[model samples]
Target chain A: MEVSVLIPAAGPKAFLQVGGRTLLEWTLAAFRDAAEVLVALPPGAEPPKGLGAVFLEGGATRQASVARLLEAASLPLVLVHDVARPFVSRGLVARVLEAAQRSGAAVPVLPVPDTLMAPEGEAYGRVVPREAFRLVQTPQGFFTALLREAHAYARRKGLEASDDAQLVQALGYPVALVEGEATAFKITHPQDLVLAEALARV
Target chain B: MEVSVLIPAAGGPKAFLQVGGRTLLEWTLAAFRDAAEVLVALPPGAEPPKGLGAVFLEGGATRQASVARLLEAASLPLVLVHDVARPFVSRGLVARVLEAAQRSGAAVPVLPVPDTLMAPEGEAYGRVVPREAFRLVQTPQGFFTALLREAHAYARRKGLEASDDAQLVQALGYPVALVEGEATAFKITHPQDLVLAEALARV
Candidate 1:
């Protein structure tokens, strides 16, 4: 039942301020109930004081940074999250944890509200069946040993993936999905920052 | 080029839903001030809003039928079909669709998928697809008048039902080119969306 959260804050936008506080600060506060917290910061980046998280110098790629965090985890459960998602709710976090405990690997997701289509050259191809697809979000949870095995297997095979769950899936593990909150959306573009500020007020 | 906007308000949800003291239909009408004409479709016995510079037509049971009604009344070279639930669509997005339509014959605004996707099997099962290959489609779908007419006629003849105008065109062998859309263009369906829409107005 012991859970440690891995926050990969090495991305260039880690220090961006929203609502008068650093983005990492918001992410740290959301996991106040976790057994332990590990933050992967960029090389030469100083860990913010008084946030009570163990900070390790992150690696070049996101996958590398997460691999380093996995080595420091002594707990049975690990939740890998992006620091850019500041509005992740306590209720959503609880749901993902519960699902992970039961299924060994779990993630939060939202149904694609708009019809989806695959792009082909200058035009679009056939419709990607909307009901058959769901959009995956974070924080993705896993059994720490299982996740380490997946990461190690990928490293040995010289393979890379965009997300932790995909790495786990590459190892042929089933990842259970729980419903996600819209407010948990990642703040990437300038307009998304505006949306985050508005959501924070709400 | 003469442009006409088709506002399909025929769906069960009445057009009178209010936000910030203005009805959603009113907000929708205000965006098309630059267009040559605006046509609204409503079910039988449903009263239409007055003084909006838009003509009203009786709508049919389905969305496709309502679109056909709007097309019949429109003589303009271009027709843009928009749902009334999306009150936050900007004038800038309208211009983009208009320009794209003029060049490509048909176009729909879309946003790139930010998250990975899984094909739904049962409760939860499947592999994640590469995010770069897909886009989430939205309304304010623009098309040439001839294209809409041909597509609709063929749809009725073939007994095909599609959720959007772009699909009907796609069935007849034309690729729908994309235009960038904004989050503010999201259609309001749930209570939380109304909160997002209200926040969008403030921003």
Candidate 2:
């Protein structure tokens, strides 16, 4: 049951309110059942009052912030998650951890629901068929030891990728995919914040 | 701007289901109230959804066939084809779509795909697609009434089916103008989306 929950929050909007509390607080509360929760708060930003967790200052890039936390993490398993993804279900977290425990590294993913399109000047261009792709969600679980090695490899190579799966894959390690939840949507848009308020109550 | 709204609600009473305080079709109908008349494409022999002012017309086997019936029934110069499933479309976006369609003859609202995209290769690994490379499309896709009719007629001539009205228009070598979209204009295709739909309704 030993786990280090790493939250690279402090995204510019992480402090923005999500109805009942700031989104960071919600994300922090999401993992209260964890063995240990380490939050990389925005640089020099302090935690809200009375929250229980290990708070560290975030850095230049997401990888840098997570790498900073990697120095202090001490657990056989860890879940590296984002602040904007406020809807991480304990069920999703449990499954992802179980997958990671078996496979050494795992990420939750959902079927790409929208037909992906890139803007060409003022209009749309190429169509990336949605069938071939999957949308990655986090609460990406890994053996804490493997993640430390992945971060060290990035440090050695000067790589700045934020996706843990990408960084781990760069080391030629395979990541298992768990079926992601629809409720586990990353809250980025203002509308998502509104939806967050609604989802939070449930 | 004599506009007629085409709501293919007959895709089995999906429109009949309630989300928020209104039936899905009513919320969709709520957006186009300023139009001349609303034509709801309905299943064969199914009565109109009670009290929504839309005139009911029988649907066909394909979505295109259903829409073709609506096109024939329309009495306006501009027609906006929207799915009842995309129930959160508000008046501002409806106006935006109408404005763009008036200028360009065809248009659809677009939101950029925000996630890190990648094609899976055997679950052990995959390659990434540039997230900046594509826009996710949404509806009430707008069109000139007769223009859509021509596109539909062309498709019927060639036996072509498209994902949306924009695709059909695109095949005719017509440039469907892209307009800014609301994040709230999301299509509720999955049951999971209905969860967000109820939440968004509270917003």
Candidate 3:
């Protein structure tokens, strides 16, 4: 099936370099198989020359940027991914698309390997059962109409979320989960960049 | 405070894998140099690694049995339990756990969960109950001597099994406080983890 991908790449993190390439390039490279790729860049942000993608001016927040990208999507299936996560595999992308096609919405998730705790004040509160949940990752796949509806609902309610799947969940829709890859994690800290480069080399 | 460290290094995984020219067990022992005593649990007929100042005991079928053996051998007022598979454990983490355990009777180091979550039920990937509410717990976990022995006895009586020493204390009605843990102290269980360990050693 033909899939259109929307990358919300406007933030400062979008330009961070990893493994000798901009995070955007790595992200776009993963989706070379997509029928159409739309990148929502921050207003006035210049993408490197020779980089191939249709660019749109992003809004203030990630939610707004996603809404703008949703407007540009023309395919039946749409994938929403963060450019900050450069290690996303093409295999994971295909799994997400397949699952979304079956369930209407789908995402990649990694099982929490360590024991979890709740902090009480400055100390630990309690252990959270690791099996109850899985760590969420992107690219989150959805039917184009379903994602557009979810975003519209968020706008109507004045709700904001860091992830697109949350907007879909807010609409009370069931989202399918495919297993995520460890390398697909986002680079948010300085040390994360070091790990990313190391993993890339491996 | 002087802490006694218990390392359960037995069975097939005890072949003493190396990183940076030192055995994994040796790397773990280096962090506890300040401790008063170090108890190493190994399988029957297996000799302890040469030149390391540690008391060796025969480990039992399960991890809890090995811990019990270490408890019987320890004489110090405080005990720290660590897994030998975790070689990147640092001196700083040992110190943090020691200090926290002294205050709360039991303590463990934990790092915040970075990725968001969704229930296996196919819910939307949203506020995974908030990342602040969850932390990834690691060793070396510290506990007072009496607490450790009592919990060990409770385990012997009840025949209950749990992953870490803190759970034994938790079942006995005491809460464990948190100390910050480093990413360097990740447990090495798979071939992929070895790659991560090798990469971390460089950085």
Give Cα-based local distance difference scores for all models: 0.83, 0.81, 0.80
Which has the greatest TM-score? 2
Pick the winner on lDDT between candidates 1 and 3.
1
Regions of model 3 farther than 4 Å from truth: A42-46, A170-172, B1-3, B14-37, B43-53, B99-105, B122-128, B154-161, B171-175, B189-198, B201-203
> DockQ rank, highest first?
2, 1, 3
Tens-digit per-residue lDDT, B116-152, candidate 1: 7777557574677887888888889999989989999
Per-prediction TM-score to the true structure, in the order listed: 0.91, 0.93, 0.83
Clash numbers, per candidate: 1, 5, 1
RMSD of each: 2.4, 2.1, 3.6
Q: Point out where model 2 deviates above 4 Å.
A: none
What are the per-residue Cα lDDT tens digits for candidate 3 across B130-166? 7756788888889998998888888778987887788
lDDT of 1 by residue, A10-89 (tens): 84467888886678888888898888999999988787788888999887788889999988998999999988889888
* Interface RMSD (one decimal) of model 1: 2.1
DockQ (model 2, Cα):
0.59
Residues A61-82 of candidate 2 have per-residue lDDT tens digits of 8888898888889888999888
Per-residue error for B27 in candidate 1, Å, reads 3.1
Candidate 2 vs 3: which has more DockQ: 2
Q: Write the per-residue lDDT of candidate 3 for residues A29-118, one digit (tens) a residue.
A: 899888899899889887777767788999998789889988989999999898878888778988999999999998898777677767
